[PDB]
Each structure stands twice: as C-alpha cells, then as structure tokens.
Ligand binder design. Structure first.
Ligand SMILES: [K+]
Ligand SMILES: [K+]
Ligand SMILES: [K+]
Ligand SMILES: [Mg+2]
Ligand SMILES: [Mg+2]
Ligand SMILES: [Mg+2]
Ligand SMILES: [Mg+2]
Ligand SMILES: [Mg+2]
Ligand SMILES: [Mg+2]
Ligand SMILES: [Mg+2]
Ligand SMILES: [Mg+2]
Ligand SMILES: [Mg+2]
Ligand SMILES: [Mg+2]
Ligand SMILES: [Mg+2]
Ligand SMILES: [Mg+2]
Ligand SMILES: [Mg+2]
Ligand SMILES: [Mg+2]
Ligand SMILES: [Mg+2]
Ligand SMILES: [Mg+2]
Ligand SMILES: [Mg+2]
Ligand SMILES: [Mg+2]
Ligand SMILES: [Mg+2]
Ligand SMILES: [Mg+2]
Ligand SMILES: [Mg+2]
Ligand SMILES: [Mg+2]
Ligand SMILES: [Mg+2]
Ligand SMILES: [Mg+2]
Ligand SMILES: [Mg+2]
Ligand SMILES: [Mg+2]
Ligand SMILES: [Mg+2]
Ligand SMILES: [Mg+2]
Ligand SMILES: [Mg+2]
Ligand SMILES: [Mg+2]
Ligand SMILES: [Mg+2]
Ligand SMILES: [Mg+2]
Ligand SMILES: [Mg+2]
Ligand SMILES: [Mg+2]
Ligand SMILES: [Mg+2]
Ligand SMILES: [Mg+2]
Ligand SMILES: [Mg+2]
Ligand SMILES: [Mg+2]
Ligand SMILES: [Mg+2]
Ligand SMILES: [Mg+2]
Ligand SMILES: [Mg+2]
Ligand SMILES: [Mg+2]
Ligand SMILES: [Mg+2]
Ligand SMILES: [Mg+2]
Ligand SMILES: [Mg+2]
Ligand SMILES: [Mg+2]
Ligand SMILES: [Mg+2]
Ligand SMILES: [Mg+2]
Ligand SMILES: [Mg+2]
Ligand SMILES: [Mg+2]
Ligand SMILES: [Mg+2]
Ligand SMILES: [Mg+2]
Ligand SMILES: [Mg+2]
Ligand SMILES: [Mg+2]
Ligand SMILES: [Mg+2]
Ligand SMILES: [Mg+2]
Ligand SMILES: [Mg+2]
Ligand SMILES: [Mg+2]
Ligand SMILES: [Mg+2]
Ligand SMILES: [Mg+2]
Ligand SMILES: [Mg+2]
Ligand SMILES: [Mg+2]
Ligand SMILES: [Mg+2]
Ligand SMILES: [Mg+2]
Ligand SMILES: [Mg+2]
Ligand SMILES: [Mg+2]
Ligand code: NA
Ligand code: NA
Ligand code: NA
Lengths: 76, 50, 122, 102, 111, 52, 48
RNA sequence: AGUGGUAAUGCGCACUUGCCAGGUAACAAAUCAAUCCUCCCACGGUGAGCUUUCUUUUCACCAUAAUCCACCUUGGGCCUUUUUACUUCGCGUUGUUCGGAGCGGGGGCUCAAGAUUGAAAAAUGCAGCUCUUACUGUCAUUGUUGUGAGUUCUGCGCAUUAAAGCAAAAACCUGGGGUGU
RNA sequence: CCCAACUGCAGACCGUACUCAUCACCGCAUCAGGUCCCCAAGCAUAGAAUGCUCUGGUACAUAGAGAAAGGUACACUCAGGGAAGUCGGCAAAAUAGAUGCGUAAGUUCGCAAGAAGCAUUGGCUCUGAGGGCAAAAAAUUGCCAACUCAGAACUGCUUACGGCGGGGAAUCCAACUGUAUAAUUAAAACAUAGGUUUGU
RNA sequence: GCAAAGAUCUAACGGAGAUAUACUCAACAUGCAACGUUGGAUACUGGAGCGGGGAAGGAUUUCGUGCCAACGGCACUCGUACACGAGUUGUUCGGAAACUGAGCACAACGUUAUAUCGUUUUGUUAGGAAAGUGAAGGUGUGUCGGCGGAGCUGUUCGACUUGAAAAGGGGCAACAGAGAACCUGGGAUUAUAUUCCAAAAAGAAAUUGCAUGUGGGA
RNA sequence: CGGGGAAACCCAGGUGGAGGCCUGUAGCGAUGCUGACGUGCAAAUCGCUCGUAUGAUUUGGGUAUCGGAGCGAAAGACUCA
C-alpha cells in the first residue's frame, strides 16, 4: 500500500486506466479514499469532513465508487 | 510420509484398485469356478514395500 | 515495594483518590421495578445495602462524604470522588441479589461507560 | 462452550505478601545452596555497576576531578568499598582533606 | 490456554537456516514465521584485515541484487572494495615507489 | 595434520595478466607482507629460493 | 487443459487446479471466468 | 555526458561474463547484556464463578500478518579539531584491556539492532447483547505498565581447549581497466 | 537500441489424505522391547529432580465376588539382643537438604575432604542492611520497583510430604578419564600418556 | 491361565439384546450378565504428556453412511473389521529445473583366455587433435547522431555474414549443508488448505518472462 | 587492590571461570539383588539398585571397507536372532 500526500496527485491516480474502483472509508476522525490500482492500493487521508465531501464529488465518473461498510457473515 | 515417487504412487494406486471383491454376477456364469477374490490384501497382514 | 509492609497496616489500607473527582456510577433497575420485586421496602434496604456494605479505605460502613449514594428517576446513582472499580458495584449488586435469592432471576449487565442495567434472563 | 476449570492464584498471592514481609525464608526453609539462591557473581556485578555509576555521576557533576575518579575507579574494582554509602563516606573524607589543605 | 506451535513449512529441523520467530496474528493465533538469513556484509579483503566497509549495507542475495548501486559502495576510488586508509596507502605507495625508480634510473643513465 | 605453518605467496604470471598465489611450507620468521625472491639472481636471505 | 476447455466448451478458464487422485487418475478443478456461468455449461455438458 | 562534502563519506551515476581483483554465500566457546514470544505483577474495561459467613474478590478475555512510507536509544567502525595525552597518565568492561602506529573532550560520517509516525487496518478478530424466528439485525467492550522472571534472534569476530585452529561451489555484489570518447 | 516509473499478458512439472506408535513402522501379533526432529504452562524447589494442578488428552488395556495355605511387590512394622546368621553383612536397615564452626595420617602440594565431627533450622510480629529516578554539607528534597540476607521479642513440635552421601583403619591389583565378551565373565583384561628399539 | 501402565459410578436415551413365568402366585425368593451416546460425578496423563506437528517406514489405516458372518485372545449396538460411496486443489510450501561434499564410475586408456577388472578431485579423464564459444575488425540490415548541399559522407548501438583468448571429456551423489519471490482473515470441508475464496476477488503483497505506451538517452 | 621488604620477593582480600574434575536430570550403559519372569510382555524383557553424564561424549541421514575375507581401545568380539 502507498499513501497519497496531496490532492493534486490523488486525482492523477484516479485518472489512470488501471484504477478499478475507489473505496471511500468513513472513520470517525478522517475519510480515506483507497484507490485500487493494478499493483498498489493508494490511499488519501482527509481529516476535514467538508473537504471530504468536495473531494468525493470531484472523483471521475469513470471510476466506480464503493462505500465501505461492515458486510455481514450472513451477507457474505 | 509425504514423499513418494510418482511411479511408486502409481503402483500403489493399482494395488488399491485391485483390492476389490468379486462381482456377484461372476458367480452366476456357466462354468464359473471363482467364489471369492483369493488375492485380497490388507495393509496390516501383508506389506507391499514400494 | 519501596517500603516494607507491616501487618498492623492492614487495619487501614489506603484507598486511591482521583485528581479531578466526581466520578458517577449508575445502576438502572427500571426493567425489574415494573414487575414489583423492587418494591418500596425492597428499595429501602437496597440503598441501605449499598450504604453500610460499600467499603472505604478498607473500613466498611463509614461512607462519610467521599461516596454519595442517591435514588431518583427509578435508577440508582452512585457518585464518589474516590477511585473505584466499576466491577465493585457489580459485585456488590450480586451480593445483594444472592442475599435476596434473586441471582437466578435478575442479571446485571453493562450498557455504557459507568452504567449498569438490570434485565431478565430471556 | 463451557468455561475452563478454575486454577486460582489466591493462596500464592497471599503467600507472596507474607514472603515479601520476610516469612517462610529462614534457615529451615532453604534447600538450594546460598550461591544457587543468590549467586555471588550477580551480587558483585550489581555492586560494581552501582559504584561505577556513582563515580561517573560525581565526575560529570565536577564533585571529583579525574585523578580522584581514577583512584577510586581502581579501588572499586579492588573490593575496597562495600556499598554505595561506603564510597560516599570515603569521598567526603577525601573532600574534607582537600579543603584543609586548601 | 498456553499455546504451542508447529512448523508450518516442510522443514522440521532447528538449523541456522531454519530459524523461527513467534508471531501473534490479528486472529489471536500464535504462529511460527521463518527468519530471513542475514549476510555478514561487504568486507575488505581477508588478507588486509577483513573489516566491514563504511557506507555499505549488509544485503543478502536478492536484496543486494535489487538495491541501488550506491548502497553497496562509495564514490571514492576502489569504493566498496578497499577502505579509505587502504586507498590512501596505495596512492602514497604508487607515487613514492615510482619516484624512487626514476631517481635510481636517472643515476644509472647519467653515470 | 601438519606441524609446520604454511605460506600463501602471490606472484604475477610471467606470461599472462593474472596472479598465481602459490602455497609453500613457511620457514621460521616469514611474515605477511614479506617480499620473497625466487630465481638465479635472488639474494641470499631467509625465505628466498635459490639454486643450490 | 485450459486450451481444451476453450475448444470443447467455448468457455474461458481463469484458473486450473490439478491433482493426481490416489487411484491414479488426474482431476482438474477448473474455474470459469465470471463472464461464463458454470451451471449453464454444466447443463450443456449434460451433468446438470 | 555524473555530481556534493576538508573528511569520514552523501546524492536517482551508461555499458562491461573480452580481461583482471576483491567481497557475499561462509561456518566458532564462555561470560554478560538479551529479540520475537512465554510467564508473572500493577492499573483498568467486559463476561462468568462463589456468595448461611467472609472475599473493593476468584477465573477468562482485552488480539494487529506480510509488504511499504517518513525518520531518537544503544552498540561498533571511522573522520575532523584540540592532542603543552603517560616526568618517583588517562578512558573503559562482570571479565582476560587499550592509547603519539593518536587516549580522552567538542563537533561529525557511517554500519547493526531496535524505538516512533503513518499506509495496510478495522472493512478484520474476540466477547456480551437489543430486536425479532433468518446459521437476522441493533448495540457495548475492544488495554496500557513494569532497574519482574525466562527466552541464542542479536551484540559475536583473524571467534574455544588446541601437537583440535573448525567445508566447498553455484548464484550474486562491488571495483580496476576499457568502451561511450 | 538502452535505462526509469508504470501498465498488459502468462507464470509449466511432481508431492500434498492419514499415521508416526503402550494399536497405523521392525520384532510371526493391536507384543511392558526398539525407533530421528520441533513447540513445552502454574506452584513447591537449586531444578527439564520429584509431587500435585489450568489447557489439550484419557477412563483403553477381561471382569465380578472375596481376609485359605503358599507366593510376588516400583509395601510396611516389630519387644529384648545386635551379625551370634551366612562362603561372604547378600538383603534390609542406616546417612541425608542448607548454614556456621571444624577436620588426621599420607601426598606428585593439585589433593586427601562432604575426611572425621559438633551446632542451628518451625510459625508469628518486628528491626536493620543491601537501590533507581527526578528536582538548583544536593552530605537534602521528593517519588518508586524488585528481592535477598542478618538480628530480636513472642509462640510452638507428636522431630512429622517429597527428594537427598553411612563413616573409619588397612592389604592386593591397575596410575588416572576411557574401552570391552549384543544373550551367564566389566576385571587385575584392552587402551592410554610416558619409555625403548627397528626399517627407511 | 487371560494379575505391570491406579477407575470407575449414576440417570436418561438407543438397541432384538427385556421388567422374557404352566399352575400357585402383591412385589424379593423364577431373564442373568453385558453394550454405544449424552448429561452429571470421580479420577488419571501432568508440557521429556495415552498433547499438537514432521522424517524413516507403512499406503487408504483418513471421511460419511450402512453393517456385526469371521476378526479386535472378555465384550460391543463400537472399530484401524466388513460393504458402499467420497476425499489430497500451490507462480511463492518441499523436490526438480539449477550448487557443491564424503564419494560413485560413463567415456577414454590399459589389463584380463574372459570386463562382469583397474585408473577416473593432491585442479581434475585420456600418448592427449574431446573448446563448434567467440574480443575485435571487414561486410549488409534495423534504431539513432553530426555536417554541408527527403537523399549523400562519416559515426553510436542491436540483427547477418574474419578469429584474438578460453589448458585439463560427459554426468550423478544433501527433502536436516548451500539455495529458495506470500501471509494474514474466513460462516471455506463429513474429510484439504500459507494449496480453496472472484469484482468491494476478505484481501494486502512479492517475484520472474515477454511485450505496449509514456519519460529520457542512443 | 591492601600489607610487608634495601633488594630479591613474600603475605593477605576480591575478580575470573579452567578441568578427558566432582554431585546430579535427559541421554548413553549395565553392577548387585545371583530379585521378577523363566511353555515370559520378551528366541534377553521387567523392577529397584548401580557406571558415566563438556567429552577418547551421544545421535539422524549420506558415503567407504567383507567371506579364508572385512573390521576390531583385542572379547576370537562383530559382519541383518
Ligand atoms: K515435512
Ligand atoms: K577392551
Ligand atoms: K570400472
Ligand atoms: Mg512419517
Ligand atoms: Mg515406502
Ligand atoms: Mg567467583
Ligand atoms: Mg557479522
Ligand atoms: Mg553508500
Ligand atoms: Mg499440485
Ligand atoms: Mg566468515
Ligand atoms: Mg495437504
Ligand atoms: Mg496433512
Ligand atoms: Mg510425533
Ligand atoms: Mg508391523
Ligand atoms: Mg517379517
Ligand atoms: Mg521429570
Ligand atoms: Mg519439574
Ligand atoms: Mg485434565
Ligand atoms: Mg494396549
Ligand atoms: Mg480400564
Ligand atoms: Mg493383559
Ligand atoms: Mg495371601
Ligand atoms: Mg559368624
Ligand atoms: Mg554359623
Ligand atoms: Mg563357616
Ligand atoms: Mg547391599
Ligand atoms: Mg596434614
Ligand atoms: Mg606389602
Ligand atoms: Mg583401570
Ligand atoms: Mg568420567
Ligand atoms: Mg572407569
Ligand atoms: Mg568402539
Ligand atoms: Mg555377556
Ligand atoms: Mg555382566
Ligand atoms: Mg595392561
Ligand atoms: Mg614407566
Ligand atoms: Mg482357572
Ligand atoms: Mg500371569
Ligand atoms: Mg492394569
Ligand atoms: Mg456416562
Ligand atoms: Mg422376577
Ligand atoms: Mg436385566
Ligand atoms: Mg495426578
Ligand atoms: Mg503420578
Ligand atoms: Mg512444565
Ligand atoms: Mg507427546
Ligand atoms: Mg475412522
Ligand atoms: Mg473377543
Ligand atoms: Mg477395509
Ligand atoms: Mg472404496
Ligand atoms: Mg588417486
Ligand atoms: Mg568429490
Ligand atoms: Mg570428470
Ligand atoms: Mg592424466
Ligand atoms: Mg545433484
Ligand atoms: Mg529424507
Ligand atoms: Mg536446506
Ligand atoms: Mg520452494
Ligand atoms: Mg486433517
Ligand atoms: Mg565450573
Ligand atoms: Mg567428568
Ligand atoms: Mg560424575
Ligand atoms: Mg564418580
Ligand atoms: Mg531415546
Ligand atoms: Mg536372577
Ligand atoms: Mg513359573
Ligand atoms: Mg543416569
Ligand atoms: Mg562381498
Ligand atoms: Mg581366548
Ligand atoms: Na518382499
Ligand atoms: Na509397543
Ligand atoms: Na484374573
């Protein structure tokens, strides 16, 4: 796994052709945007919730968006 | 143990497939002389040592 | 450890004191109070039980003002500036229920931080 | 799934309190040799390490100069000082003599 | 509930190349994981003293293969083979011995 | 199995660009870094090899 | 085995796991790509 | 067509199995420190046991895999500076030492073991439970201390008694030359 | 054509069950014999001794009834005497841990030696000694952890788990540690270091 | 005789294995003794274990269902018995591909009436011509560079066609030496699992071999 | 590191951890009971007792030497009862 530092290079990761999906994780103190690429899972950590909402809308519509939840054993 | 050559494993496979009783319909043939398999093997009685 | 212990000191064992006090524990007996087992007279010696049985600095009965016990809103509230384990009032509760032959009826359970509620076995 | 059977350390903890106060460790209760229970090398290592730590602290604080430090360092290795207090008392005797000479 | 472990690969002998470390998993299981062998590190020649070289790491096989070149040497001449003091001795020796030869040769030619 | 010490002496190849590194029985007093002379014109010194 | 599956059944195998059984025969666990449905081809094969 | 630093050496600087030279692989007692882990404490949460009498109690659990990013503790080697450092000396180990062939002190370079921050990773695991059956949902907990005791991973070798001195090779690494020129 | 960070595609072969033993192997057998490696808890204690216990495992090895003689035992005891037994103290008994004091002849000076011998030991309640860290005669002021040893008063014993040398005076032999007749001989036999001789 | 390794008791359920009866007769004195499972009880092993995994050896003894003629020296409703039907999943684990060791002995040579004999690692076969590999060039092709007027000359680097230097034939022998890119979670089995899980792969990686495009050199 | 001595050197404490050293597990053996058993659990075993247990030590796998031959710290021992 690799950490994305700034938002400018995060949009470059999602723009890649091998970015299958973006997993949005809602932690109580931060929001993580985990981009599943071919070789690495790139993560951008956003602490401010207002910025996280703005960033989520800015995600390209080509990349599928997955909202990370706790899937149940019965569900799985 | 885990290790065995494939040739040894194949010899043991054939011995496993031969360790069967005679089919019932064999005993109903016209000139049958076979009542039971006289070459039945048990892993505790006789060893193969492959 | 630093100072060798004496047998005579077991008469008065020092109990810890919080820096910023007013720690509150709550016993929620709402579920069994509706069934009448926790009656007016039962509630009397219930809080009385928590009064003279709760130990302080090793000694028992002399609660003084370090520990405050109150009854309102159908729940029991214990407030103290001293350092106490939350399990202690679960252990005191189990002592009471055994004394009144209720341990096979009422189970005490943890709902949150500092709260114990009394329910029934399903 | 049933709970495990209870193995309790209550008696051991009570006995630990008594032993911490000095019970159940007299002459009649000892089965191993004195060195087996408390090796003399371990006692020597602790004592010499204490003496060397104190001399370093005194040298760094400029309570003793390097010549006094070196003299006491060799004497600590030579089993001259029985414990920390014995070394401190000797340093006071040296310091008192230097003041009179001054 | 004190745990005991088993070999999880197919080598069950406690040799120097099969060392194990106890590992507690996120599933609260105590398992055995193989420790990687370590290389002693890049050394000066055995005849010269066989000392570890400054500025060079101790990488084994594939880690040494994949590492950057400057992890295994220094920019000085003979970097990663000889130490700084050994390099200085050779530079001084090369100049001084070659100077003595010229003086001896010039004396013979002049005579 | 041998009481006497052994010496590894490095020579240059007389015909090729390489070293030789011969191994001989060390005489007493031979030391690492000593120069060894072998041949017709070698001086008479301990460790040198000379025609009889 | 992967190539034979393509020729015989026109399905794509993403993974083939093989083992030699104790009776001497070789058995293959063939996972088909998510595009194909294993139940559907099993019906076509005739095993249902 | 590499480059910085007085230096120890730093930096992401092309090709090299024509050739040559080194290194890794590669081995080693004891003493003392001791890793991951194990066991004990201390404090605190969760559940259970005992409860005629005592017991702020007894028991259980409180977990974080590889792989990566960023970069103060100990040990070793080294550099620079001050060396008027050893005249009836100093630094260091439990221990057999060490120093003008450069000790100690100041400031540094580097290597080895570990801290620590973060990605992974809570979305997992564990325990109890709300609701009401579906191997259903809701929800609560989800730890830190220890100059404690073990623990050969490691520090650790030109490294053991020795008339005992402790395999090799493949594979790989770096350089010297040379090519680029 | 060669480097960097990616990316796309593909990663072939054999082994993989179970066992590893008081039932899975060898011993004719589900035989008290034999068979290499790893992980290894708590208390007592010097402890991988020995005893008991949480986890895991087990109640499987023909059973029931049940004081004959005579047996076998990884079972005991015995008044008075104490080796009178016997080829022979065989067997059994005995000594026993730790600590202080003390210890002969002989000797290759290393030992002999735990020589031989005396004495103490429980439980309780105490008192000293043995440290770490932090804070500007700091020769004090705070906080705190792990234990060990020693000394007192009081109070006890029916000498009371396990484990754990009997000792001394002499002769013969071999210097010693070792080896060695698997299945009747472990020795004084063999080896050994040391000494000598021979061939080259 | 079936006596070393301490040991079993109780209720219920299951089972044909019972509470099994001419007269007389309320029950005892006329169906005994033995089984498996579950819950309780009691005890043992006591971490150098009747624990959990492997090598050698064994080779289906593993698993489920059924079954009780023989066998498990007593017994069985039980079984490592019998019958039927199943189970062993790997780019990374072990081996091989692909290292050397104590060693072996193919070739070669020699010997022997006879090769079914001897030599064959002290760097190393053999009176012994055992290298088919190839620096650099010359000569064409492909990717570049510079010059002057898309071409021309010269040039760098890979493909095709002159010959430096490389002595000492080919192989085996380690599943504990060397080497070796994966490791957690699972509600994933009746039985396999660092081997199975499929788009939110529960997932996170690491490594080879080819390619394509981008960036930069040629 | 103390104490003596003109010198030579001697006497005292500590540190350290040597040894085909000692007690003693596992391991490797086998002394006595001339114990048990002796149609055995066993064509050599069992119990207690006993030797040794850092070394000339014990042990896995691999490899090398054999039938008038091999190997043997030597008993004519061992070379698949
Ligand atoms: K294995
Ligand atoms: K012998
Ligand atoms: K031959
Ligand atoms: Mg096996
Ligand atoms: Mg076999
Ligand atoms: Mg000592
Ligand atoms: Mg090293
Ligand atoms: Mg470097
Ligand atoms: Mg396979
Ligand atoms: Mg080395
Ligand atoms: Mg398997
Ligand atoms: Mg298996
Ligand atoms: Mg086993
Ligand atoms: Mg058998
Ligand atoms: Mg046989
Ligand atoms: Mg034991
Ligand atoms: Mg024990
Ligand atoms: Mg148990
Ligand atoms: Mg049995
Ligand atoms: Mg039984
Ligand atoms: Mg029997
Ligand atoms: Mg009798
Ligand atoms: Mg007599
Ligand atoms: Mg008589
Ligand atoms: Mg007589
Ligand atoms: Mg006797
Ligand atoms: Mg005397
Ligand atoms: Mg005489
Ligand atoms: Mg003798
Ligand atoms: Mg001995
Ligand atoms: Mg002897
Ligand atoms: Mg022998
Ligand atoms: Mg005999
Ligand atoms: Mg005998
Ligand atoms: Mg003799
Ligand atoms: Mg003599
Ligand atoms: Mg009879
Ligand atoms: Mg009998
Ligand atoms: Mg029995
Ligand atoms: Mg039962
Ligand atoms: Mg009846
Ligand atoms: Mg009946
Ligand atoms: Mg027991
Ligand atoms: Mg027992
Ligand atoms: Mg234990
Ligand atoms: Mg076991
Ligand atoms: Mg079965
Ligand atoms: Mg029977
Ligand atoms: Mg069968
Ligand atoms: Mg079948
Ligand atoms: Mg030869
Ligand atoms: Mg060889
Ligand atoms: Mg050859
Ligand atoms: Mg030759
Ligand atoms: Mg091979
Ligand atoms: Mg093997
Ligand atoms: Mg290996
Ligand atoms: Mg592998
Ligand atoms: Mg299994
Ligand atoms: Mg010793
Ligand atoms: Mg000895
Ligand atoms: Mg001994
Ligand atoms: Mg002895
Ligand atoms: Mg054994
Ligand atoms: Mg007898
Ligand atoms: Mg008899
Ligand atoms: Mg023994
Ligand atoms: Mg033969
Ligand atoms: Mg004879
Ligand atoms: Na046969
Ligand atoms: Na057996
Ligand atoms: Na009987």
């Amino acid at each position: 796994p690799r950490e994305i530092k700034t938002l400018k290079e995060f949009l470059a990761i999602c723009s890649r052709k091998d970015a299958r999906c973006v997993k949005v994780k809602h932690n109580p103190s931060a929001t993580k945007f985990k981009v599943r690429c071919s070789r690495y899972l790139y993560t951008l950590v956003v602490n401010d919730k207002k910025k996280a909402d703005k960033i989520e809308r800015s995600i390209h519509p080509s990349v599928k968006k997955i909202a990370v939840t706790a899937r149940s054993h019965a569900k799985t | 143990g885990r290790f065995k050559p494939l040739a040894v494993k194949k010899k043991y496979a054939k011995k496993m497939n031969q360790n069967k009783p005679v089919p019932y319909w064999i005993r109903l043939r016209t000139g049958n002389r076979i009542k039971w398999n006289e070459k039945r093997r048990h892993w505790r009685r006789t060893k193969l040592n492959y | 450890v630093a100072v060798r212990a004496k047998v005579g000191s077991r008469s008065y064992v020092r109990q810890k004191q919080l820096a910023k006090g007013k720690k509150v524990f709550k016993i929620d007996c709402s579920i069994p109070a509706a069934d009448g087992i926790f009656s007016e007279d039962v509630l009397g010696n219930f809080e009385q039980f928590f009064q003279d049985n709760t130990k302080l600095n090793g000694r028992k009965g002399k609660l003084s003002d370090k520990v405050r016990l109150s009854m309102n809103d159908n729940v029991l509230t214990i407030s103290t500036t001293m350092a106490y384990r939350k399990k202690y009032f679960k252990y005191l509760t189990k002592k009471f229920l055994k004394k009144k032959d209720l341990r096979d009826w009422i189970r005490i359970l943890a709902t949150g931080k500092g709260t114990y509620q009394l329910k029934y076995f399903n | 799934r049933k709970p495990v059977k209870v193995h309790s350390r209550a008696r051991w903890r009570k006995m630990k309190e008594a032993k911490d106060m000095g019970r159940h460790n007299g002459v009649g209760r000892r089965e191993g040799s004195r060195e087996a229970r408390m090796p003399s090398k371990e006692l020597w290592m602790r004592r010499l390490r204490i003496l060397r730590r104190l001399l370093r602290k005194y040298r760094a604080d400029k309570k003793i100069d390097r010549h006094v430090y070196r003299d006491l360092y060799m004497r600590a290795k030579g089993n001259v000082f029985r414990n920390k207090r014995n070394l401190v008392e000797h340093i006071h005797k040296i310091k008192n003599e230097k003041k009179k000479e001054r | 509930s004190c745990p005991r472990v088993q070999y999880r690969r197919r080598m069950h002998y406690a040799t120097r190349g099969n060392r194990m470390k106890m590992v507690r998993t996120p599933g609260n299981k105590l398992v055995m994981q193989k420790r990687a062998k370590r290389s002693q590190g890049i050394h000066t020649p055995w005849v010269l003293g066989h000392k570890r070289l400054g500025g060079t790491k101790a990488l084994r096989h594939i880690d040494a293969r994949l590492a950057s070149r400057h992890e295994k040497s220094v920019s000085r001449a003979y970097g990663g083979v000889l130490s700084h003091d050994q390099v200085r001795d050779r530079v001084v020796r090369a100049f001084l011995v070659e100077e003595q030869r010229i003086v001896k040769q010039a004396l013979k030619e002049h005579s | 199995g041998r009481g006497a010490a052994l010496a590894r002496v490095e020579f240059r190849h007389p015909y090729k660009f390489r070293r030789v590194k011969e191994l001989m029985v060390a005489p007493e007093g031979m030391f690492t870094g000593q120069s060894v002379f072998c041949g017709q014109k070698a001086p008479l010194a301990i460790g040198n090899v000379l025609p009889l | 085995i992967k190539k034979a599956m393509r020729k015989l059944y026109q399905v794509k195998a993403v993974k083939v796991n093989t083992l030699i059984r104790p009776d001497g025969l070789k058995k293959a666990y063939i996972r088909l790509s998510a595009a194909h449905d294993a139940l559907d081809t099993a019906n076509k094969i005739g095993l249902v």
